[PDB]
Amino acid sequence: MQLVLAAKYIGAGISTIGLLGAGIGIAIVFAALINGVSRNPSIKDTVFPMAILGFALSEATGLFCLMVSFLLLFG
Amino acid sequence: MQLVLAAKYIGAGISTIGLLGAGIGIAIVFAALINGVSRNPSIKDTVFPMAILGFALSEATGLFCLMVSFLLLFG
Amino acid sequence: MQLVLAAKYIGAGISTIGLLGAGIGIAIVFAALINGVSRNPSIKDTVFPMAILGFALSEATGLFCLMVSFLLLFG
Amino acid sequence: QLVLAAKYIGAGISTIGLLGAGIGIAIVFAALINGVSRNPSIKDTVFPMAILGFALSEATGLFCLMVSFLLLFG
Amino acid sequence: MQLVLAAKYIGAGISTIGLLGAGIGIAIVFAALINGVSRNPSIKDTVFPMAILGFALSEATGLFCLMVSFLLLFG
Amino acid sequence: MQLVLAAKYIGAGISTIGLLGAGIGIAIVFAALINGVSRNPSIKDTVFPMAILGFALSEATGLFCLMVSFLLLFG
Amino acid sequence: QLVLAAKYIGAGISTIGLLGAGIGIAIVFAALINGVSRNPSIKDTVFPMAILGFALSEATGLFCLMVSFLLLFG
Amino acid sequence: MQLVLAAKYIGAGISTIGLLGAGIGIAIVFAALINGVSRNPSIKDTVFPMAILGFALSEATGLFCLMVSFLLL
Amino acid sequence: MQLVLAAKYIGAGISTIGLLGAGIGIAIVFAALINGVSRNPSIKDTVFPMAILGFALSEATGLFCLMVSFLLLFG
Amino acid sequence: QLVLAAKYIGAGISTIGLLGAGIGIAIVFAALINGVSRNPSIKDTVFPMAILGFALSEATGLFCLMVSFLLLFG
Amino acid sequence: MPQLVPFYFMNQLTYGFLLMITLLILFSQFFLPMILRLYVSRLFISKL
Amino acid sequence: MLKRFPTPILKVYWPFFVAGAAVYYGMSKAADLSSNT
Amino acid sequence: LTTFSLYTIIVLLVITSLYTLTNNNNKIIGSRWLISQEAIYDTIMNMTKGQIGGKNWGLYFPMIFTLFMFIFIANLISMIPYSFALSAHLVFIISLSIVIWLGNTILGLYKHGWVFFSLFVPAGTPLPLVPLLVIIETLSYFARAISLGLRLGSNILAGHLLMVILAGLTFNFMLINLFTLVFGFVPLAMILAIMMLEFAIGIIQGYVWAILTASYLKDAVYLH
Amino acid sequence: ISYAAYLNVAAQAIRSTELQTASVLNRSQTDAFYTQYKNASEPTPITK
Amino acid sequence: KLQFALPHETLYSEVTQVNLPAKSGRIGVLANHVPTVEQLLPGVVEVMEGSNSKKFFISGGFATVQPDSQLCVTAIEAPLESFSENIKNLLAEAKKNVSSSREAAEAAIQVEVLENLQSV
């Protein structure tokens, strides 16, 4: 039905909105990394695994949002 | 039926929005971690368990949004 | 009838956005904790009742919101 | 009915308001943890004030929730 | 009509959104009070009436919003 | 008719959303006041007028949003 | 009647544009109070800068208001 | 007719929302200017041009939102 | 027909929301430029090409929103 | 028709997501400038860190954009 | 209160503005300077 | 307690009173328009 | 005639009793009540001396005092839950605000000629936005006309409407089955907290009025 | 309390298990005087 | 590098990692760390040159990273072990007495030192 098919194309868009939060989040982890590494130049080797972890987890929340979009599109 | 089925897909998209707060949240804990480790050097042994706890709790609130999304989407 | 069931599922979806706020709140408490500890690691035992208290109260606001979401969804 | 639907919908929209309170409470407690870690000793005055700040943040959330019940039933 | 009645309730729901800014506002004032007081230990005789003023004013926007919500719903 | 009166009510609800930006704004000025006063110990004679000015204009933007809410709501 | 309905609704939506300026004004003034309190004496140079930033942020809100009026009055 | 003209009026309302962001953007540049000048004192003569450049670009984005409002009319 | 004409204008309108993030972003890069240059008095030669790069990239995100807005408005 | 309208609207809705990415890119670059200015010399290590954070921030916007194109063009 | 839109506005406002002008004159000549009389009497004993 | 003191009450404070009068006349017309409902 | 007329008389009679018999007879020591109205005298004396601060601070000291006391008493009397507000009629409060605002601007024009229009450019700026900075200064200047009133009116009104609507809800709390009337102290407690707040937001607005229209007179007397 | 007074006292206090040396005791225990002088003359020579 | 100079003695006047209690909370300096000026608060201190660590109890002082990795610490006194229980007891009595009896400032530093010593 036109109503249902329409609803899919609208609904896909609505779902996409959630993703913004993760994007800002990733930047915040990298910003902290730069400042941290600046403050002690040699902290990098310890800190860098932790930094990539913080990115990955923040990104993951974005992935879950994007999954719901793909579920509506290709479910 | 066409109305309620369109409503399911829309309602799912609305629920997806809730995830954004958790995504930023994960980053906020990790940004603090990266800065903190840079201040002290060696704070990390105590603090890394605290960081994981904080991430998980922030993430959980996001996940509550996601489970409502799948309840609406499927039924 | 379809409208009634639709309204149940929509009303649920709308509520779900509220959960995000408590999720951000939790993250903020842990970021503050991490910074506090790195700057003064001996505060921890006095802080421990307050830390759990602030986390819980922040999270709680989201859980109130979540109960409304499920009440609408299931009816 | 449209009215039957409408009360359920109104309950949904008002419920979003709780979000602000969830952030708010945490900002008071976060500042408490930062203050106390800085001083070791601000806490005696500040801890009563921190519970007050929490109450006020939470109170805003209760207005939102109360609107949800006024919508939902009414 | 059914439509006019719907618009009262719906308009009221929409109105309830504004309250969040005041909630966060009050928390920010109290956070700043704590931060200033943690810095000085003794600014407070000047600062305390300033903080209460900020609190009252931030709260007021929320109360204005709540007033409109009742006017739409009941009125 | 039914639609027009409905639309007035709906428009009123939306108007109330505008208040939030002023609410957060006022809190920022008062936070800054406390920060400034804690920084100087003694800035208050000049700065208290500056802070009141910043509150007023921030608040006023919210009041405009409120006033549209009234125009639509009553009218 | 859709056109008339839309005019009243559209006006409501327009208020949202104003909200950002409310925050904006506060941000300029926050910087002002911080700068002035750290120096004491920066203020005479800084005060023109502060008023300028306020005005520019305000102007963005003014555009939103003009559109609101454009709908409302027609 | 009714639907399209209605949509224009709604659409105008929606477009104002973009403008809110630009208002904040401009404010941030001037806030930074004041902070820089107050920490340094003397930076101001170099820094004031940078502030004007940053302001203009932030405002321009808001201008894009505004012109789309005009297009939709 | 009418519904589609309305829709083209609507999709364009929603797309404008995207533009805002680039505006705030541009301000943030320039704010950092100012803060760095004021901190060092002399970082500027290193920091300036970095700042231009960050500006361009931040702006570009809003540009994508704008071209999508045009594609929806005009077809 | 309703379906064709929905494609155009739907595409528009997807576009909102990009705002987060724009802010994100800027935050990393802001930090790059702060790190470089803080050390005078962290820059060669910090420059790839900064680029990585920008890229990832941009990417969330890009995902929104391709979904927008898919609904828009078909 | 449920109802707080009069149409009696000019009536209200006549008595309202009468109270404002009344309080201004009343304060200025009577009630504000009779407090300043207390101040000046206390200070006059203090100064001698 | 009370005493009549010949303090300024009008020789500086005329514009406040004048503004009240302008709004008073306009409010007569506003009241008349509202008294039809 | 109206309810409004009866409450304007009540406000006048309270203020007369506050300055004719708040003190037993006439003392140089004062009764416990008059200790308050000494502290009030000093915080408004030193406030409009702190604000307008001229030799004309005291020329506007009766003006700032009768604007304090009117709003201070009428937002305590109006907070009695069976008292018919003078301040929840927006048409009176906003009219009073515009009256004082016009009485600042006209006085400023009278005293400082057409060089009053120099107020609307406080400082130089590049010439293509010099006219801009006159227009969106004057717009913000007569936004002051309605802002001062609408803050106070909305605050006082919102307290009363909140109470009446909540009174209706706590009734329906008891109409909900008796298992809800186990541990039913919380809605009563919500109204009690609101009542503690309602005196506070009424006294705060009376001070905020009188500092802001001291600031407006500071601007009008001392330009830029 | 003035910072360099604060540190001095802190060193002395830290000089108060108890395994401390004579140079420490000398570094924290001393007797002294000071003299305020006009402009010349000696306003009272007050002990340090 | 590090210096931990005292007036009549010295204690360390390239030292790899040094952990300091500062008016910036707690600060760690590792290899080349950014150059600082921090007044050192009364402290429990760890100094590591390689993995070897020497633990110091410190009267407060000044900390200054020089940009060549020369960590200038100047303090009036500072091993941890020499200070490390009966001394804490003496301070408790003294803290109490000064608490009852600038006199405020004296009691405050004494409370701080008694605690700081208890940490040792």
Numbering used by the authors:
A (entry chain 0), B (entry chain 1), C (entry chain 2), E (entry chain 4), F (entry chain 5), I (entry chain 8): 1 to 75
D (entry chain 3), G (entry chain 6), J (entry chain 9): 2 to 75
H (entry chain 7): 1 to 73
K (entry chain Z): 1 to 48
L (entry chain Y): 1 to 37
M (entry chain T): 26 to 249
N (entry chain I): 8 to 23, 27 to 49, 53 to 61
O (entry chain H): 11 to 23, 26 to 90, 92 to 97, 99 to 115, 118 to 136
The authors write:
ATP synthases use a transmembrane electrochemical proton motive force (pmf) to generate adenosine triphosphate (ATP) from adenosine diphosphate (ADP) and inorganic phosphate (Pi). ATP synthases are macromolecular machines consisting of an ATP-hydrolysis-driven F1 motor and a proton-translocation-driven FO motor. The F1 and FO motors oppose each other’s action on a shared rotor subcomplex and are held stationary relative to each other by a peripheral stalk.
Classification of the resulting dataset yielded maps showing six different F1 states, corresponding to the catalytic and binding dwell structures from each of the three main rotational states. Subclassification of these populations separated each catalytic and each binding state into conformations with increasing rotation of the rotor relative to subunit a, and increasingly strained peripheral stalks, designated as ‘a’, ‘b’, ‘c’, etc. Overall, 27 unique conformations were identified: State 1binding(a to d), State 1catalytic(a to h), State 2binding(a to b), State 2catalytic(a to e), State 3binding(a to c), and State 3catalytic(a to e). In contrast, the structures that show the more strained peripheral stalks appear to be calculated from images of active enzyme particles. Density for the binding dwell conformations suggests that they contain MgADP with Pi in the αβtight site, as was seen in the bacterial F1 region during ATP hydrolysis. To facilitate comparison of the ATP synthase conformations that occur during ATP hydrolysis, backbone models of the protein structure were fit flexibly into each of the 27 maps. This observation shows that, other than being in a catalytic or binding dwell conformation, the differences between the structures are mostly due to deformation of the peripheral stalk subunits and the rotation of the c-ring relative to subunit a in FO.
